[PDB]
Amino acid sequence: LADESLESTRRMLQLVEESKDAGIRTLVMLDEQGEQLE
Amino acid sequence: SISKQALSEIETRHSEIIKLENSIRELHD
Amino acid sequence: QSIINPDWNFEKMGIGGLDKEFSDIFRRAFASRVFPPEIVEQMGCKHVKGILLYGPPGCGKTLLARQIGKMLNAREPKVVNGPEILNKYVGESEANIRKLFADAEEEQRRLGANSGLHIIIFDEIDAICKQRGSMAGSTGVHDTVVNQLLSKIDGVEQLNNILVIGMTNRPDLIDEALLRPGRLEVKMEIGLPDEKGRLQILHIHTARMRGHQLLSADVDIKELAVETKNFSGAELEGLVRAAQSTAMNRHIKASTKVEVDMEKAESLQVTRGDFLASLENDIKPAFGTNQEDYASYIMNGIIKWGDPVTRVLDDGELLVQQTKNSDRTPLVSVLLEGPPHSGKTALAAKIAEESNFPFIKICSPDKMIGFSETAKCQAMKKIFDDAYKSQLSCVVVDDIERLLDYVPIGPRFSLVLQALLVLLKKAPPQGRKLLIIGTTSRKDVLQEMEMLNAFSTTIHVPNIATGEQLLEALELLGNFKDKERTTIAQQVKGKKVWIGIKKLLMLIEMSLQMDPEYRVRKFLALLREEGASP
Amino acid sequence: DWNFEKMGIGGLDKEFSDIFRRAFASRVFPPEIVEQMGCKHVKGILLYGPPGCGKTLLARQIGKMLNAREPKVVNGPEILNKYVGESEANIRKLFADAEEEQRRLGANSGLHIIIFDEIDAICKQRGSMAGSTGVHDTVVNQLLSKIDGVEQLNNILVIGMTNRPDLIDEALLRPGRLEVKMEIGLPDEKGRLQILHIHTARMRGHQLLSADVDIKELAVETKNFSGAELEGLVRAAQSTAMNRHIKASTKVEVDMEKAESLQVTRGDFLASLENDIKPAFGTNQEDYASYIMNGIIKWGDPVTRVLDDGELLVQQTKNSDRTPLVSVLLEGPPHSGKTALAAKIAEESNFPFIKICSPDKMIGFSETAKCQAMKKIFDDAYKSQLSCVVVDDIERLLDYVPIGPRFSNLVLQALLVLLKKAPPQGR
Ligand SMILES: Nc1ncnc2c1ncn2[C@@H]1O[C@H](COP(=O)(O)OP(=O)(O)OP(=O)(O)O)[C@@H](O)[C@H]1O
Ligand SMILES: Nc1ncnc2c1ncn2[C@@H]1O[C@H](COP(=O)(O)OP(=O)(O)OP(=O)(O)O)[C@@H](O)[C@H]1O
Ligand SMILES: Nc1ncnc2c1ncn2[C@@H]1O[C@H](COP(=O)(O)OP(=O)(O)OP(=O)(O)O)[C@@H](O)[C@H]1O
Ligand SMILES: Nc1ncnc2c1ncn2[C@@H]1O[C@H](COP(=O)(O)OP(=O)(O)O)[C@@H](O)[C@H]1O
Ligand SMILES: [Mg+2]
Ligand SMILES: [Mg+2]
Ligand SMILES: [Mg+2]
């Protein structure tokens, strides 16, 4: 229970942080193409 | 004689996991 | 067609002599459910949904469970064993016990007051329903489960399409509320089989062997059935299996190796010899048989040394005959008295055996070595209480003076006297009988304690008191013969003799350990010295 | 390939013959005949006996005999676990393969054998042993339901071993669950001979045992010896004959020159008999060495007559059957030797079982303790073929003191009853 729970929390944390950072990065880049396209 | 002692037992609750990994990994990919 | 299936033989299935049990079962329950509902409501009532069958271990209870399900014209039964409905994760046990009463609730809603009875079989109904406040260090699963089941079967919510049947060996651990009217009322007991039922039990199990002609015509079922008493169905099956097994082995051979006798067992027929041997050294009852007592108290038979060994038997027979066919006097007692070493404890077992009363027992001190007075009283009370459950009986209390713990310095003795002096007047429940025979060696002491006016009669057992009787006893025992008996006769004449009959089986033996030339002299010297005087 | 000799278990021929007759007899003819009878095979064995008689060897050999899958084992209480509902789960595990195979072939399965050790650890009386929990009043019910009940099983054989046959639950011994209840008992002289022969075979095959030793003397002298005791005696004799070549000094040494002439002598057997191995049953010679401290002299004829009468009585209690029980009483003044003329008669009888119940081993006991001790010493004498017992200084067993008078009643009653109770048949 302890080992599996620690594995789960660690993997969940790292995966969630990666996804969050990547999403924010895509959010920030989209505006540049938008303005250039105008 | 008055000294009466006792042994005991325990339980658990358990949670859900096994395939959430697949969904998270697919999202990341 | 409502519930009962067409086939209702009850011997095809395999059940034995249980006719009355099922008739009572139907008379008390499973009767209203096959009747005009109009009339049912006209009297206005509800049905009954519980039974608990409690019998001695291995007495056909389990078979009834798997066979009642077959005879019912309905869906099916379910057998849930007691020790299975517990699970590790929290809450699972309650969910599991809940599932067992679901499709009956669904049918009472969708077919309210319509459809059939639901059967749930609780095997080992002692495993889970023990108590609610008797455990300790055990979460609470047991109490929660019992509460859940009790509330579900009986409570505000109403159910009318269910029949719970529980089965157990020991009913003294079952919970209280369950036996309390309403959930598992109308209890029933399955006792041991009777004489007639034993024949049917044997017949059911021996049909296949007789079908293929593997059973010798010599064997008789009735002989075996009468011979085997205080047996259970399991024991009868064991006897049959062991007889088959002794033949099984009679054919095979080889201890260094193992091989069959070249399939020579064309018929391997079982003969009564195999049954006799198996019943002798393989199968033994659980109740217990009064055989070792009967063959240990009468160790050398009952020889005839004269008239005083016939009058006593005749009087005992008369007393038995009186107790058998009288109505004014249900209880009769008698006391045997005589000097020590006179064969009283083997002239009281014989009288008991001559009468063929169904219930015979003998309470003697040898089974209570080292017991305080309280335990002695408890054991004697138990013996009599058992004797109070038959239409005839005969109880023998031998060597009374050793029960009261008598030693003539003061003197000193024990509760036992009062228990024995009250038990000997209590008449048994109406329409029964009893007979108590007592043995003692000191009349005067029993007269002192005011016990000799509670017995109804006393018979006298004498010892050899004349030379001719001694010679006849020697002749019938057959040890000294020829000129030896002649010289013994010449020497004995005169001076009489005062030797008891258990003291004449020790003198002869101590005499036959010298050389042949000195046996007669040693025997005569021992008799002269020890013989004493009256 | 098999042979009764190979297994190497000697002194229990009747036992094995009976077990074979009643447990592996229905499994040997072509299925046709046995099927035509409609008989259910026996499934169960229970073995019991006092320690050292050879129970765990029989189970091992039966397990190794069968040409079946390897047997399982449960070393006593190895199925109890904390998490509620896991002991029942574990006990339920041992029957999975048998169930599946019964469902799969049907009436053609291969024996599944389960070997329980110390069956008394778990399966005990219901209602008692109730200290707390209840995990002990549930395992028994699970086992009772599994062995027979719902569902049909005919391809198992459970074997149980224990030394306390008076505690097992009664339900678990009714014909159907554990039917064969045999009994292992102490061997007789022929069994001792067989045991000694078996345990020495590998030595005589290599000329490592000097011809001086005689087996018959070893068998005769050893009395009330059990299998474990015989094996221990042989091992100790080997060790003592074996230490000689070693030189127990600083910087441990060993001689590689004379070691090739290793031999074992009867003297070593005697040394191990009188130094390191001591049986329980019977009386050791050290007992008789403590009641005849100064021998038996002849001061006249009144020391010869007593011995002759003792011989006559002992001879009668061996060759006559109208009287299985005898008694005698030695009386005289105080300080005259009535405890060294009562031990020398018992010693010179050559009976198998001899005991002495004296009053100096129960200093301070109350009445009940004395009654229990006397009952035990007499009960152990009912389980042989012919025995002798000595009750010396009666007047101290039941406390006597001329003032009063005062004494104990319970002990006197126990004595007066125990002198008229015939033993079982033929003993
Ligand atoms: N009346 C009977 N008719 C037929 N067979 C019987 C009868 N009584 C016992 N038997 C035989 O004995 C066995 C039935 O015993 P059963 O399984 O009913 O005992 P049980 O109720 O499980 O015992 P317990 O309550 O101690 O667990 C079967 O082998 C069956 O053939
Ligand atoms: N006709 C007979 N009457 C009595 N006993 C006989 C007779 N013939 C042979 N015997 C033998 O003698 C024995 C009689 O003595 P028994 O064993 O009854 O002692 P007892 O009367 O109980 O003595 P006590 O009352 O002092 O204990 C019988 O058990 C039997 O072995
Ligand atoms: N012929 C003999 N008979 C008996 N004892 C003898 C004889 N010769 C020597 N002794 C010695 O007598 C001693 C045994 O005496 P013991 O103690 O038995 O007397 P006792 O009667 O038991 O005394 P008490 O009854 O007061 O205990 C031992 O030392 C024993 O060797
Ligand atoms: N009949 C016998 N033949 C050979 N060895 C035996 C015999 N009986 C006991 N033994 C010896 O006893 C030991 C095993 O004893 P064991 O069966 O474990 O005793 P217990 O029955 O008290 O468990 C081994 O050394 C074995 O050789
Ligand atoms: Mg059952
Ligand atoms: Mg008597
Ligand atoms: Mg003394």
Author numbering:
A (entry chain K): 21 to 58
B (entry chain I): 186 to 214
C (entry chain E): 206 to 619, 621 to 740
D (entry chain D): 212 to 638
What does the paper behind this entry write?
Supercomplexes of NSF, α-SNAP, and either a syntaxin tetramer or one of two binary complexes of syntaxin—SNAP-25 reveal atomic details of SNARE processing and show how sequential ATP hydrolysis drives disassembly. NSF comprises three structured domains connected by flexible linkers—the adapter N-domain followed by the D1 and D2 AAA+ domains. Six NSF protomers come together to form the active form of the enzyme, a homo-hexamer.
Following 3D classification, 41% of particles formed a complete complex, all of which have ordered ɑ-SNAP—SNARE spire density and differ largely by spire pose. Substrate-bound reconstructions reveal a flattened D1 ring in closer proximity to the D2 ring and a strikingly different ɑ-SNAP—SNARE spire structure than observed in the 21bin20S complex under non-hydrolyzing conditions. Again, syntaxin is bound within the pore of the D1 ring. We observed a nearly symmetric ɑ-SNAP—SNARE subcomplex comprising four ɑ-SNAP molecules coating a four-helix bundle. Even without further processing, this structure was recognizable as a parallel 2:2 syntaxin—SNAP-25 sub-complex formed by two syntaxin H3 SNARE domains and two SNAP-25 SN1 SNARE domains; this binary 2:2 configuration was previously observed in crystal structures of syntaxin-1 H3 and SNAP-25 SN1 domains and was unexpected as we prepared the complex with full-length proteins, implying that two independent SNAP-25 molecules contribute their SN1 SNARE domains to this complex. Presumably, disassembly of the binary 2:1 complex had occurred and was followed by reassembly of the 2:2 binary complex before vitrification. Of the five 22bin20S classes with the 2:2 binary SNARE complex, all are found with syntaxin in the D1 pore, while two are observed with the N-terminus of the SNAP-25 SN1 domain in the pore. Unlike the non-hydrolyzing 21bin20S reconstructions, hydrolyzing 22bin20S reconstructions are only ATP+Mg2+-bound and substrate engaged in protomer E, consistent with a sequential hydrolysis mechanism (middle column). Except for the rebinding F protomer described above, all other D1 protomers are ADP bound with variability in the presence of Mg2+ and inorganic phosphate (Pi); in most cases, protomers C and D have ADP•Pi and Mg2+, protomer B is usually ADP-bound, and protomer A is always ADP-bound.
